[model samples]
Every structure is written in structure tokens, then in C-alpha cells.
Target chain A: MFAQLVAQNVLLIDGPLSWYSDPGLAGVLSYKEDTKELVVAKAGVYYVFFQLELRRVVAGEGSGSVSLALHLQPLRSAAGAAALALTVDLPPASSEARNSAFGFQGRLLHLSAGQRLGVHLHTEARARHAWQLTQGATVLGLFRVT
Target chain B: MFAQLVAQNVLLIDGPLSWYSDPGLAGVSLTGGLSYKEDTKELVVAKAGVYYVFFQLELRRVVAGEGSGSVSLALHLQPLAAALALTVDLPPASSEARNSAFGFQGRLLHLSAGQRLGVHLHTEARARHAWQLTQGATVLGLFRVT
Candidate 1:
């Protein structure tokens, strides 16, 4: 019973991939690389999530972060959906030995079948040096709220 | 009809008590906006909404490897691969004030109903150095947001 129900309402994606795609690598969501939008299936409330684990390497100083973009447009028409942005950031962890921090942030959002979502990131000078958003330490997913 | 459906939600417990009882320990306060079960160590939701959950643990380590040898502590939040892990050399109680104990680590995230949440901690320190998790110092909590 647990196995059957768990699959029906949840989708979890593992990654360290570039946060630059929408219908990224095809999993539970859809996206068109050229259009850069990931589609949401079905309709209802959903819990959205994101987390990045960055380990300090070649030590340095500075800060950086990522932002989420939500877009809702009519099917077949990219004509009229606005974008909502939410951001989360991680700071330098060199002050302590073997120091590193995971920057996580999430929010509840609404989307209908055919709605789309995308992500954009911003990195600054030293921010790029002290830390790197490395591989297999991040996640993006959705669980429909019944 | 929406009201008739239950949302998948979650909760966490840190103390060493049977999951069946709430208002656990003496200082810890545990409550699920809707209802929860200790027998299952889960939060059962009656409504759909965005929820944020977290864990707090107190870590103690002595200098000079007193009573125990090695200690490892870790925490995991369901549906997310991201976790908090710390490995330290625990100090001995006889090492004078060398023993250090304080609130350890935590993870915060957005969640929905039906998502069963929990944590696991492993330590190799002496009983004196590692105090049992309690409500006053250790906790697993969840708050709902629209």
C-alpha cells in the first residue's frame, strides 16, 4: 500500500546539473530546452523545494545564491503568465575548519496542468572562489497536496 | 470535496519516548495543526498547506578522548537527500571543563501532507558526555504556512 500511494503523489529529482534548464533531463516534469520552461502536471496545491550543499574548496571569501521563477501560461500560448521570484543564499564558511554550509529554501506555490517553472542563478567574484555548487548534493521536487 | 481529502504532512521527534505520546518529555512541545500519531512517528494531515519542519540537537565532545572513542551525528529530512553530518573527537568528563555541550545542527524545508518525516543520530561517546535528547535542548518541529 505504501509503495503504490507514494508513487502516485510524489516526484523527487537528484542533481548537481546546471540550474539552467526547465523540462530538464526528463523525469516527472516536462520542459522544452529551446523555450526553457518546465511543465507542472495535474492541478492542486504543491510543496516546492530546493537545497544546495556547497563544500569549501581552494578557500576564499564572498557569497552567492539561486532564484526560482514561476510562470503560468495558457496551453499552446506563451502569451500571458507573469513570473514570481524567490531566492536563497549561502555564505563563506572558511572561518571554521572543514567548514561548509548547505543553503536551503522552499515555498508553497500553485500551478495548473500546463503551467511552467524555471530557475536562474547569480554568482559574484569571490563568491565563486570560496564555494562551488557541486554535484549530487542538491534536490528539486514536488508533492501534490490532496 | 477538497475538505474531504487529507493533506500529506510530517513531524519529527528527538527524545527517547514511544511515538504514541505527545507533549513528550517535560520541556518539549509537539503539536500537529491537525493530528499526529506516535505509534507511527508521523504527522497525519487533515488539510493541505505549506509546512516548514526542522530538527535541533545538542552535541557534546570532550578533549583528550575521555570516556569514549569516536562520535558521529547525522540528521536526514525525508524526500530530500540533503542532510547534516558532524564527526568530532569527544572530550572526556575528567578533562576539566574540556567537555562542551550545546545545541548542535538543524535543517529547514517546505513540506506537504502525507510526507512522513524523521531523523537518525549515531554517537560513540560515553553516556556522561552525551545526554539523552530532550525537549528543552533537542526538538523536531513543523509549522504550516499558506
Candidate 2:
């Protein structure tokens, strides 16, 4: 199964970011709203990709950076449970109302059925930053490889 | 059959970059069939089919005190000549010393055997203002969908 998830206007906090299925495309992956995770239906290798267009909402003084990680949480007894598959870091913006686009894409191997995947974000100063999800700008895509 | 190649301590200039097979992963199928030519810095496919191609590049400017400017990057596929699949324009740096990351992915359909794929980058900034790849953060993944 393949899925491309898109985000609307939302604030990026220090946790999983919620996403909605793109209405224009056909996808079979399941997206859980409460947990903000995409559950895998088939056990196989998969290619996951994400792009985040972040805009600083508040201008504040201090040294800080924005970090994003793709987390893979497997069911109990699964190997390597709750692991960070990939991560990207962006340097602190010097001023307010600045925009930067960050992205990370890679392949995950040996995913078991019922494993969950999601994008988790962390910021040095949560109050001074947020990811402004613009149309077709921020997205997460999962494609089965086998 | 799948593959997830990575860039390790490579420098990204206004040209193709080299990739190495990740030793930690078991990708015998792809490691044997798909090959990266160091001289050309392109991946050669052994079979013809619809394939999903994706990449993430975490670029950090190496030179200090360089003037701010945007970078234009593209992914190209080739049999003899290169075909553009995607182009990304990295917005100008928020500060002279700041770093950023960008990513993009797409499907390549109906590829003939022996076709090549590669990443190409160009910038208006001087060549001295090159970008460096973050260790293990930059990746290129390819898989046969059919």
C-alpha cells in the first residue's frame, strides 16, 4: 500500500504532527488521528519521504534550532521498537517571519505488520517557532518497495 | 529487491555527488544489480520497469562570510541524455552562517534497461560557497515498484 499525507495549517510542537490523506490521490495506508501515526498493513520494505516548509511565527532572541525525526514504533516484542529512522536539523533563524524548508527521505527495511510510523518535531524554543504548512509544501509519503 | 544508498562525508558542489552502499543494510539484490559509477557519479539500473526514486540532501554551507544567495538543484534520469524529474530552489540563507536541508521524491515510469539516474546541483553563489553533506543524513533510495 502507498500513501501521501498532507498537512493543513498547523503549529509544530514537540511531538507527532497530524496529517490528512490527500483527497486528490488514492492511498491505502491507514492514518490514525488520535495517535498521529500511520500504521502499516503489509510487512515489507518501504520508502518513506517527508518535506517540511517551516516559517518562524515569533521573533525572539536566543540560540536555538529546529529538529525533525521520523519515528518507527513497532508492536510489543518487535525488534528495534520505537526507533528514529531519520532526522534533519535546521539552524536558528536570525530574524522573525523567516521561512526554511527541510526534508529527509529514506528506506525502512523489515517493518512488521502493525508497526506505526510518524514524524516527530522538537525545537529549542517552542514558543518562538512553528511549521507553517502551505499547500503542497509539507508532505509525508510512504511507498511499499516489495 | 531494494536499495538505500547513502552519502558519507561528501562535498556537494555544482555537480553530481558520489554515493556509497550502506554496509549495515542487506541489499544484495540492489547492490549487485544497481551500480554507482564513481567517475560519473550516476546510478545505473540493470532492469527496465516502473521505479520509485527518492532523495534527501542535508546541505551545510562550508565557507564562512559568503554573501547570501539561493541554490537550484535537480534530479536527472538518463539513457544517453539526462531528463529532469524535479527541481528545488532553496531560499536564500537567513544568515550568512546558517545551514539548511531539502528533500524531494518522485516515480520514474517506463524506464528502459541501462538507464541512469543522478542528482545535480547548481547555485548562483561562487563555487567556494559549496555545501557539505551531513554524515548519514543525506540519502538516495530506489526501488522497483512493479
Report how far off residue A138 is in candidate 1 (Å).
2.9
Candidate 1 C-alpha lDDT tens digits along A1-34: 0000001101112211233322343342454455
lDDT of 1: 0.40
Give the per-residue lDDT of model 2 (tens digit) for A57-139. 44432234555566676434434323333333433555452455454454545456887877776665434434443466667
Predicted candidate 1 versus true structure: per-residue lDDT over B72-118, tens digit per residue: 44444444443555454544445223343323343344555555454
Give the 10-residue window scoring lowest on summed lDDT in candidate 1 chain A: A1-10
Point out the worst 10-residue segment of candidate 2 chain B by lDDT: B88-97
Q: Give per-residue CA lDDT, model 2, range B83-138, as digits (tens).
A: 44344343344543345545555556555688777767665554434555566655
Residue A110's lDDT in candidate 1: 50
Query: Which pairs of residues clash in candidate 2, taking residues 3 or more apart in a chain or in different chains?
Result: none
Cα deviation at B130, candidate 1, in Å, is 38
lDDT of candidate 2 at residue A100, scale 0 to 100: 55
